[PDB]
């Protein structure tokens, strides 16, 4: 997908991918509850890292950053009471 439409318009796809990120981390999302393929998630996110985000709209980046910060803060502060090693 990236190699086929990067020539024309990667920006709109970047906006779509950020929309996916927002919906997967919103209220009652999959990421917070921990379900879903972990390997797929890490592969998509690492692939996302390599994209260029030059002309992405400010509103969607602001929405995704606020959502992820709230989720991760509530995760770290309310972290688990035990931890098991092998």
């Amino acid at each position: 997908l990236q190699v086929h439409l990067s020539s024309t318009c990667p920006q709109i796809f970047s906006e779509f991918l950020l929309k996916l990120i927002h919906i997967l981390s919103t209220e009652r999302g999959a990421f917070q509850t921990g379900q879903g393929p972990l390997d797929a998630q890490v592969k998509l996110l690492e692939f996302t890292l390599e994209q260029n985000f030059e002309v992405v709209s400010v509103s969607t980046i602001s929405a995704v950053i606020e959502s992820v910060t709230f989720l991760v803060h509530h995760y770290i502060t309310c972290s688990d009471k035990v931890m098991s090693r092998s």
């Binding site: 509850t33 921990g34 309310c78 688990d80 009471k81 035990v82």
Partner: protein, 87 residues
């Protein structure tokens, strides 16, 4: 006092399971109390925050759970909830 506890529990997310059993134990203990003449059980049931706390309790999300293998609460919590509901 009861309204304050129920609203803060319903509002507060990520309440641990050990705290959940402590809460359940205290709720049995407080329900044994009378108030000074409608019953306390009717008051506790009437408000919807009891729905919200029970939904949180029975959903067993555990959003910090690195070990979400068995969402079971253990026999102690099950016996505590059963006696509570019997009350």
């Amino acid at each position: 006092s009861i309204t304050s506890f129920l609203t803060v529990l319903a509002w507060y997310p990520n309440t641990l399971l050990r705290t959940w059993c402590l809460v359940l134990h205290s709720l049995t203990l407080m329900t044994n109390m009378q108030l000074n003449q409608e019953s306390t059980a009717h008051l506790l049931v009437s408000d919807p925050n009891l729905i919200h706390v029970l939904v949180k309790f029975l959903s067993g999300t555990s959003p910090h759970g690195t070990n979400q293998h068995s969402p079971q609460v253990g026999p102690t919590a099950t016996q505590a909830m059963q006696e509570f509901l019997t009350r």
